[PDB]
Amino acid sequence: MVYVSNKYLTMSEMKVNAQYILNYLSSNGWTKQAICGMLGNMQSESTINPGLWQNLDEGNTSLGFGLVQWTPASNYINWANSQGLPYKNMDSELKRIIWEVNNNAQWINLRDMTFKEYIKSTKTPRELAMIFLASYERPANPNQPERGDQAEYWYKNLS
């Protein structure tokens, strides 16, 4: 059970999605700290909603889409089609993230941490949230300390 929609999720809805993500990425070698660092970013990006378009502008493929707001959406969407995967889908997006780790895509090492180091890291979810913000997400506004608060909130409240 996951929520997939073009709608901002409530804290209760997010917790359902966040536990799912934690389970899935644990099976693929990520630390709970690394996952929670990423979840803190996903909350700001999309309220951890794989169905969410930037500004809720459904179908605008020039802008952000999905858990981490892949931008332009079309690059992710093109990737899913080439893989035979449905784009609007939790597992498809989690597969994209694994593919990015494996092929050194998206990540730019601005904090002396590679993506492969990141997923194995036991630094705090706050520190990891900030590294992931700077290295992976790189939004127009870099000042989003809330992302570290949120990472810690998920680390405490998920299993």
DSSP character at residue 104: T
Contact status, residue 33 vs residue 124, Cβ threshold 8 Å: yes
Task: Point out the residues that are catalytic.
Answer: 45
Q: Give the method of determination.
A: X-ray
Q: Which residue has the tokens 């073009």?
A: 6
- The range of the structural domain enclosing residue 149 comes to 1-159
Phi-psi domain of 55 (left: phi exceeds 0; alpha: psi -120 through 50; beta: other): left
What resolution in angstroms, rounded to 1 decimal? 1.8
- The CA angle 95-101-103, to the nearest 5 degrees, is 100
Which token pair is 30?
A: 């990520």
> Binding site residues for substrate, as ranges?
45, 71, 106, 137-140
Q: Give Cα separations from 76 to 53, 71, 86, 89 (angstroms).
A: 13, 8, 11, 12
Domain count, the chain: 1
Residue 127 and residue 80: Cα distance in Å, rounded? 31
Contact status, residue 101 vs residue 7, Cβ threshold 8 Å: no
CATH label of the domain that carries residue 88 = 1.10.530.10
Does residue 72 have a cis bond before it (omega within 30 degrees)? yes
